[PDB]
Design a protein around this ligand. Structure first.
Ligand SMILES: *[C@@H]1O[C@H](CO)[C@@H](O)[C@H](O)[C@H]1NC(C)=O
Ligand SMILES: [Ca+2]
Lengths: 59, 82
């Protein structure tokens, strides 16, 4: 719905530590795993990184 | 960091100009690089590295489809993340 509470402006997204942050350093939660904003990351066979809050995997 | 003049020939690398365009020859190490006035890198490389090298200019094999084998070694369809 259109709920009521404490938000912060749309340029800012909520971080775990009570602050909210722009999406630049907004970590990724791939598999739940809290990747830092720049994490290059891959098996032999997959290839994955965290860009901006989204986790870009490939194969 | 020390700006040197030109031509320049230290360590077996002759840094010369050819046809008004700058050249770097590494014939001992089996390559020739150059640049034009507009700025267009070119690398002539010896067949000694045939299916040896791997970088941004792809492998020196015959095939022209497989030459995105990443720093790990992964055939990636994308010409960008590679
Ligand atoms: C290139 O060398 C690899 C071994 O490093 C070999 O498996 C492959 O078949 C070779 N391909 C060509 C183009 O010779
Ligand atoms: Ca090739």
């Amino acid at each position: 719905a259109c709920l009521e509470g404490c938000f912060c402006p749309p340029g800012l997204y909520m971080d775990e530590r009570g602050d909210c942050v722009p999406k630049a350093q907004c970590p990724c939660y791939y598999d739940g795993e809290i990747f830092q904003p720049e994490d290059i990351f891959s098996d032999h066979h997959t290839m994955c990184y965290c860009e901006d809050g989204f986790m870009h995997c490939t194969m | 960091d020390q700006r040197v003049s030109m031509p320049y020939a230290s360590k077996g690398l002759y840094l010369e100009t050819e046809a008004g365009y700058y050249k770097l020859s590494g014939e001992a190490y089996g390559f020739v690089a150059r640049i034009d006035g507009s700025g267009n890198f070119q690398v002539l490389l010896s067949d000694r590295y045939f299916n040896k090298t791997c970088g941004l200019c792809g492998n020196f094999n015959i095939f022209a489809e497989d030459d995105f084998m990443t720093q790990e070694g992964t055939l990636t369809s994308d010409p960008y993340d590679f």
